[PDB]
Amino acid sequence: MASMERFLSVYDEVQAFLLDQLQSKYEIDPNRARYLRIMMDTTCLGGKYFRGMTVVNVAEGFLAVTQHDEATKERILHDACVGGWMIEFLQAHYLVEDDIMDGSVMRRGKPCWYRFPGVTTQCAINDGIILKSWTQIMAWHYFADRPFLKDLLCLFQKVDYATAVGQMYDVTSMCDSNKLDPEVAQPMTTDFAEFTPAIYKRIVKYKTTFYTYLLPLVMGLLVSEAAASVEMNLVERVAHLIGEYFQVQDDVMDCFTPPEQLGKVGTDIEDAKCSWLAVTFLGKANAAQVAEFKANYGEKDPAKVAVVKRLYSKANLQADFAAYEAEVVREVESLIEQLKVKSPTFAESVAVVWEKTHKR
Amino acid sequence: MASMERFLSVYDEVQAFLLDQLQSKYEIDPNRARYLRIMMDTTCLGGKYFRGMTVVNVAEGFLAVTQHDEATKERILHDACVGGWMIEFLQAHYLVEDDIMDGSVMRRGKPCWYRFPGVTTQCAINDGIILKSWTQIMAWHYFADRPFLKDLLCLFQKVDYATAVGQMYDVTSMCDSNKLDPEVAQPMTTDFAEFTPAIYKRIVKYKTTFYTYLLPLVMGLLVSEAAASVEMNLVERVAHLIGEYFQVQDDVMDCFTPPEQLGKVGTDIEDAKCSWLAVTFLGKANAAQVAEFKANYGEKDPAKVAVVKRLYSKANLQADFAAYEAEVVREVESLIEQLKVKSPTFAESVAVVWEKTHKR
Ligand SMILES: CCn1cc(C(=O)NCc2ccc(F)cc2)cn1
Ligand SMILES: CCn1cc(C(=O)NCc2ccc(F)cc2)cn1
Ligand SMILES: [Zn+2]
Ligand SMILES: [Zn+2]
Ligand SMILES: [Zn+2]
Ligand SMILES: [Zn+2]
Numbered sequence: 001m002a003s004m005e006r007f008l009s010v011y012d013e014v015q016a017f018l019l020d021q022l023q024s025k026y027e028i029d030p031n032r033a034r035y036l037r038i039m040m041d042t043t044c045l046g047g048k049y050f051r052g053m054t055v056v057n058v059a060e061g062f063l064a065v066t067q068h069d070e071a072t073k074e075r076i077l078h079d080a081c082v083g084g085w086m087i088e089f090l091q092a093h094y095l096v097e098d099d100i101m102d103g104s105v106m107r108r109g110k111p112c113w114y115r116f117p118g119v120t121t122q123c124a125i126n127d128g129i130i131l132k133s134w135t136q137i138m139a140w141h142y143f144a145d146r147p148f149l150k151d152l153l154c155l156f157q158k159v160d161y162a163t164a165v166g167q168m169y170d171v172t173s174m175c176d177s178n179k180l181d182p183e184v185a186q187p188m189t190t191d192f193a194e195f196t197p198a199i200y201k202r203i204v205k206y207k208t209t210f211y212t213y214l215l216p217l218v219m220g221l222l223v224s225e226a227a228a229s230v231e232m233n234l235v236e237r238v239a240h241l242i243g244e245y246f247q248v249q250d251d252v253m254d255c256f257t258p259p260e261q262l263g264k265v266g267t268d269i270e271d272a273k274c275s276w277l278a279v280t281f282l283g284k285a286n287a288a289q290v291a292e293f294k295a296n297y298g299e300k301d302p303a304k305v306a307v308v309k310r311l312y313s314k315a316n317l318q319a320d321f322a323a324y325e326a327e328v329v330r331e332v333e334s335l336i337e338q339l340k341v342k343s344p345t346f347a348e349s350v351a352v353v354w355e356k357t358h359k360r
Numbered sequence: 361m362a363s364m365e366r367f368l369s370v371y372d373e374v375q376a377f378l379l380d381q382l383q384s385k386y387e388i389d390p391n392r393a394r395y396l397r398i399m400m401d402t403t404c405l406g407g408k409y410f411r412g413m414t415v416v417n418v419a420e421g422f423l424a425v426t427q428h429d430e431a432t433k434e435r436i437l438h439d440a441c442v443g444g445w446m447i448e449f450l451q452a453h454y455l456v457e458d459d460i461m462d463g464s465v466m467r468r469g470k471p472c473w474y475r476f477p478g479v480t481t482q483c484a485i486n487d488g489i490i491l492k493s494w495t496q497i498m499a500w501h502y503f504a505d506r507p508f509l510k511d512l513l514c515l516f517q518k519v520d521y522a523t524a525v526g527q528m529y530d531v532t533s534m535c536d537s538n539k540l541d542p543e544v545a546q547p548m549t550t551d552f553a554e555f556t557p558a559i560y561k562r563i564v565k566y567k568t569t570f571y572t573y574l575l576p577l578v579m580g581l582l583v584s585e586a587a588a589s590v591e592m593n594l595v596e597r598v599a600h601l602i603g604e605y606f607q608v609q610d611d612v613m614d615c616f617t618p619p620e621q622l623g624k625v626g627t628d629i630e631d632a633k634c635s636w637l638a639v640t641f642l643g644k645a646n647a648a649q650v651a652e653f654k655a656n657y658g659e660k661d662p663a664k665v666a667v668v669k670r671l672y673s674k675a676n677l678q679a680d681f682a683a684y685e686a687e688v689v690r691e692v693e694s695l696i697e698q699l700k701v702k703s704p705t706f707a708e709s710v711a712v713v714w715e716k717t718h719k720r
Contacts, residue, residue, distance in 0.1 A: 026525050027562050031537040036528075038542050097489065101482045117545040122461045125485065126527045129457065133521040140514055153513065154500055161493040165386050167486045168396075177391040182398050185477040202387050 010081035052084025058220025096128035166206025173274035209243025238335040251276040272298025370441035412444025418580025456488035526566025533634035569603025598695040632658025
């Protein structure tokens with residue numbers, strides 16, 4: 001059976017399970033069950049399922065080299081699908097809540113969930129809570145007797161936490177750290193001293209890389225009972241590297257990809273985000289360019305945003321991007337080679353993850 | 361050592377642990393660690409700690425009748441405190457998010473967290489996420505080798521989920537169920553058909569009782585390795601009963617307790633909440649009273665709210681409250697007696713929980 005059709009069938013099975021359990025154990029009525037079904041579909045479906053399919057892909061790689069009964073192969077693949085859906089649902093939780101937090105308008109060419117007329121922020125915040133709770137309901141139901149349950153829950157938990165910490169790093173990235181204070185409304189930075197590569201790296205490493213690359217890889221390993229076939233420090237290093245490159249690409253697209261292709265109108269400039277573009281621009285600009293950057297960044301005024309975009313163009317950031325890209329290719333290939341020592345199979349799965357990221 | 365001082369010392373220990381772990385493993389800087397410390401204090405401290413002290417109280421009861429080494433007694437009490445703080449932190453998560461969801465202004469005579477000038481909704485939503493993540497970080501750190509870890513995590517998980525489901529029941533309680541639809545903005549009910557005792561019961565049972573009474577009781581049992589000393593169906597029944605009475609009292613106070621004593625200006629009437637008052641009023645009103653209720657309920661206009669309050673006064677709901685109260689005393693005393701068969705000690709802890717609720 002092809003991997004994606006297996007993955008999507010398991011969504012239907014997991015959906016039915018969660019809703020059936022709401023009716024039998026949580027006293028839900030048909031109308032609220034229908035709302036939750038619609039919310040699940042709208043928030044969990046319609047992306048590429050890269051995260052969840054990674055779990056499946058890693059597991060398939062091991063199946064090709066490991067002896068098992070057919071019923072075991074099916075059980076491992078089912079497990080990988082369930083684990084993949086845990087990660088998709090975790091992502092859906094963070095996208096719902098992040099869209100609310102950020103006042104976002106669109107996501108994948110449709111309105112953000114909270115903006116649906118029959119939702120509202122009041123419900124949406126809670127809907128995003130439920131999305132994450134479902135991850136745990138899935139785990140406890142499908143993996144109850146599994147030897148990996150402990151390690152899976154502990155990992156999931158650490159990744160979730162890392163993500164929320166990353167969210168904090170991101171939403172506070174345009175404030176001066178020394179002025180953070182719950183009692184005092186936060187001014188935007190005037191000096192931009194904290195727009196550095198290392199500070200940027202910390203934002204991206206926590207906010208995206210742990211749940212986008214680390215978790216799918218290591219979950220694939222746990223449902224395969226294969227974690228002792230890898231050097232876990234390598235898996236972390238390669239995850240964080242590829243995840244960083246992914247976020248840089250996202251940052252560049254926010255500014256330069258036409259909205260109809262982006263699925264939204266990008267506002268990182270108006271939001272004064274610590275983006276790869278802003279940090280790389282500041283690492284090469286002259287005094288007058290920095291000054292003009294500071295006069296225009298982090299302002300809704302479209303004239304000011306057009307000025308920032310122009311500054312980035314004239315600064316030939318495309319060439320810094322190619323140079324970053326080249327270095328990432330070196331490092332990711334080096335880590336892939338190192339992973340071949342203990343597992344050629346796992347190494348190949350990381351190669352596939354890298355190709356899918358590097359091309360898109 | 362007195363229970364409350366033990367409980368509060370453990371807050372300091374758990375705080376230090378979480379922040380120290382942010383620095384050593386999550387790359388946090390001192391300023392963000394200070395924000396998170398302030399957020400933790402502001403959202404977790406300053407209530408009565410009834411929930412968390414219940415875990416401690418149940419555990420102390422068992423210690424008085426069970427043979428242990430002194431180091432075991434200390435370890436059990438430490439565990440009960442940690443488990444109590446998990447529940448306080450879970451509550452803090454739900455109060456942060458609920459205040460945002462509801463546009464609340466105050467909580468315990470201070471501004472809601474999101475309203476602090478240096479917070480904002482953008483941060484606060486995520487801060488509430490972090491509050492719940494800390495529950496799991498505590499559990500995995502302090503209970504890693506404990507035999508109860510599995511059952512504690514699974515229980516916690518089910519309670520959290522029940523709570524979020526309850527939140528949904530509550531925020532949708534003034535809509536007609538058959539019209540729930542994410543695509544269509546939701547009108548307030550005109551008939552109030554769904555303001556019934558059974559529907560009310562479902563709201564309160566999920567939104568409050570599982571995390572306020574069930575979880576503290578059963579966590580006290582799990583850290584005591586005492587769950588097989590009770591009939592778990594009785595513990596559930598008594599939890600849900602006492603929790604329902606707690607919520608009724610809360611509902612009555614929302615309307616009739618002066619704000620300075622309430623710690624907030626109550627808005628259940630303007631918010632069209634399915635309260636105990638609205639449901640009991642509708643179960644005794646005549647046709648003209650129902651009509652006047654419908655013309656005035658769920659409207660910000662202070663004249664209309666004063667009309668609703670007057671309708672409740674004239675309707676002598678205080679007498680229905682006394683009659684409800686009497687029935688709850690019968691039933692809770694009956695359940696307490698039933699709990700005495702397998703555990704007099706646990707029965708006495710439930711009695712204490714009941715007294716603390718019944719008086720306040
Ligand atoms: C051009 C060659 N090169 C650039 C770097 C670099 O570290 N850029 C800064 C940066 C920090 C964090 C990120 F996530 C992405 C990028 C390394 N080699
Ligand atoms: C007056 C004697 N009495 C009232 C009831 C009753 O069920 N009231 C409705 C109600 C439903 C749910 C709740 F949580 C609280 C209250 C039972 N005996
Ligand atoms: Zn965001
Ligand atoms: Zn972006
Ligand atoms: Zn609420
Ligand atoms: Zn209330």
